[PDB]
Amino acid sequence: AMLYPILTQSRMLIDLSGTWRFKLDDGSGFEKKWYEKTLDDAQLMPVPSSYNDIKESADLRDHYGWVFYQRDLNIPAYLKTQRIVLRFAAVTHSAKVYVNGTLLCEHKGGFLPFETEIPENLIRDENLLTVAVDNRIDHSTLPVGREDESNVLGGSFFPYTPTKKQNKPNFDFFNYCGITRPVKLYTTPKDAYISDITLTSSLENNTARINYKIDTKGSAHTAIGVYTKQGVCVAQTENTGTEGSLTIENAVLWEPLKPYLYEVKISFGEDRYTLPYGIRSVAVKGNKFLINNKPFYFKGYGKHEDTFPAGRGLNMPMNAKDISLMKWQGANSFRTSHYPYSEEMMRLCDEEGIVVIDETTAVGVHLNFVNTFDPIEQGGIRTQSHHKEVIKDLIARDKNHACVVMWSIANEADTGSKGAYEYFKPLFDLARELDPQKRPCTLVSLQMVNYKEDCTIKLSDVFCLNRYYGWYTCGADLQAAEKMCREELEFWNSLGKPFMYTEYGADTVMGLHDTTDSMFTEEYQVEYYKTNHKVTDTLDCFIGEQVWNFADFATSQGLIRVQGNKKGLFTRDRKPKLAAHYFKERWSKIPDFGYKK
């Protein structure tokens, strides 16, 4: 259970972000127990931020292993009358958290929150908070790191021996690590408090019924009230226990680009918590993706959390800039490729009416780009257990978001190979079991020669395809790209279920131009997209287009990465390429609902 920490009449909220001490592990930090004392001979690092790009050091950017963050934590003893909690919104990839040299918690998974109470007895007059952060990835982590597998995107013409041991990402984006999202101290009443809130809605005529389950610790009485934005109470139930329901007459529905959030206020004993909440329905019916019973057409992007110089770190001005650009362009949606995004972004999307495909950290689950899904004993991928935990934690965090309409279980896994169905079926079953709203589930399909053998066909409610007709195949032959595109997409269209692009694009360096089709130029990016839409616009089961990518982003180094991935419609500093203007024109003429009715 991970409610977003907020300031309330029963809950303090103390941000610990700022300038922290920082030290690379030299192989002796745990042996010499650096967490027991002030870090010596240390640097300074902003928190929240990825650490890789803050300095000018390749040894720091390309570090392998642990680093140690630390700050002083001097708090009033009178907080000891309350329950005291340290919340880590995200520490990438793995964390060990120490207060005064006592290990308080550990966490695996770099993109979801975790928390620990501080035992009263540990809090001295002066305290040290130390966070050790591990950046290493392998066959057991999500995202996956290679072990003996070859570098496909960053391969040399002639092999060489690396100077130092390094991570081997099985994914494109740069392995930004550190204290990615805010660290905060918060409090709740000690004896009785709210641990979780679950809300589902049903629309009977113009009356919404909101079913609630309020999970609590301790013995007290539970109450719930639903308020309009302007502050009018529209439903209230007292002494309701855990489960109940209530109704809102003439409810205002949350719609894409037309958001409406009620405020759901909960009391339990002395505890107070307010959750914003939008009322909307999601259903797949035939080849339609229905939001509030209307056939939606996705217009948008796969994104990354990527800005300079914080890397993956929470950047709230850029989040607001990015949503503004989305509305400027006529987009209505994006996918959280390839990890859960910050709660601050997710809550902002609820407020702004941006639809979200919420995706796990499960990218790189692919050992043949020994079978990927062989038994662990025979060398198969070792991620399924953690994959289950990620699904649990992602849905627990994001279940109440109106903006989340579909779960993406994995990106570009080896879904055309033997054992893939056996790996994924329990994960799809888990997502359907745990999501109270029973939203659609998908996996994001890698381009593959044997596409009819993609186990997505047996599992997903929507088929989500990553396809690069005119880039990774048919480059500079867009007539051949159109023919190859049509041949495959007519197969998917024949299945009668909704399908969409979750990735399609062409690397494009701003400022490169040619009137005559030429890879990496701004004009070719436009022609690539025109060619694909010639096909997709004729297919009635094709219900959405999300480009790769919203913006240029950092990646590992190699011969096909021109200082990162250049498939953005915008540059890394959010400037529009020619194709950004193309999509503004195109999306201006396509309705959010009823394009393919």
With tokens 């009785």, the residue in question is 192
Candidate residues 202, 206, 324, 479; the one interacting with a second copy per rule CB under 8 A: 324
Nearest residue to 350 via CA among 315, 304, 401: 401
Question: Which amino acid, one-letter code, is at 155?
Answer: G
β-strand pairing of 404-411 with 441-445: parallel
Instruction: Provide the minimum distance between the beta carbon of 304 and a second copy in the complex, in angstroms, as a whole number.
Output: 16
Q: Interaction with Cl ion in 22-81: which residues (CB under 5 A)? A: none
Active site residue 503: yes
**Integer CA distances (angstroms), 187 to 11, 82, 86, 102, in order:** 5, 6, 9, 20
- Residue 195: CB atoms within 10 Å: 15
Q: How far is the CB of 124 from a second copy (least distance, A)?
A: 10
Q: Residue 389 belongs to what H/E stretch?
A: helix 384-398
Q: How many helices (H) and strands (E) does the chain have?
A: 9, 28
Among 325, 402, 535, 547, binds a second copy (CB under 8 A): 325
Q: Which CB sits closer to Cl ion, 279 or 554? A: 554
Per CB under 8 A, does 348 bind a second copy? yes
* Shortest distance (Å) from residue 478 CB to Cl ion: 18
Binding to a second copy by residue 149, rule CB under 8 A? no
Minimum CB–partner distance for residue 352 and a second copy (Å) = 7
**Residue 162 or 231: which CB sits closer to a second copy?**
231
The torsion angle over the Cα atoms of residues 137, 141, 146 and 149, rounded to 10 degrees, is 160
Report how far residue 336's alpha carbon sits from residue 348's, in angstroms, rounded to the nearest whole number: 14
- Rounded to whole angstroms, the Cα distance separating 261 from 308 reads 32
Q: Which of 305, 343, 412, 527 is catalytic?
A: 412
- CA atoms within a 13 Å half-sphere pointing along the CA-CB vector of 6: 16
Burial of 394 (0-12, 13-18, 19+ CB in 10 A): buried
Applying CB under 8 A, among 40, 148, 204, 377 the residue interacting with a second copy is 40
Segment 41-100, which members bind a second copy (CB under 8 A)? Answer: 44-46, 49, 53-56, 73-77
Binding mask 227-246 for a second copy (x = CB under 8 A): --xxx---------------
User: Which residues from 527-556 bind a second copy, rule CB under 8 A?
Assistant: none
> Residue 172's binding partner, choosing from Cl ion, a second copy, none, with beta-carbon cut-off 5 to 8 A by kind?
Cl ion
Out of 359, 482, 503, 545, which one is annotated catalytic? 503
Binding flag, residue 191, a second copy (CB under 8 A): no
Minimum CB separation of residue 230 from a second copy in Å reads 6
Integer Cα distance of 138 and 146 in angstroms: 6
3-state secondary structure of 71: strand
Among 53, 134, 172, 359, binds Cl ion (CB under 5 A): 172
- Please provide residue 329's backbone torsions phi and psi, each rounded to the nearest 5 degrees: -85, -15
Partner from a second copy, Cl ion, none contacting 348, C-beta within 5 to 8 A by type: a second copy
* Smallest separation, CB 584 to Cl ion (Å): 22
Q: How far is CA 129 from CA 41, 69, 405, 528, in A?
A: 17, 8, 38, 51
Which of the listed partners (Cl ion, a second copy, none) does 173 bind, with a CB threshold of 5 to 8 Å by partner kind? Cl ion
Give the residue numbers annotated as catalytic, written as ranges.
Answer: 412, 503
Binding site for Cl ion (CB under 5 A): 172-173
Binding site for a second copy (CB under 8 A): 7-19, 37-38, 40, 44-46, 49, 53-56, 73-77, 125-126, 229-231, 272, 274, 308-310, 313, 315-321, 324-325, 327-328, 344, 347-348, 351-352, 511, 572-574
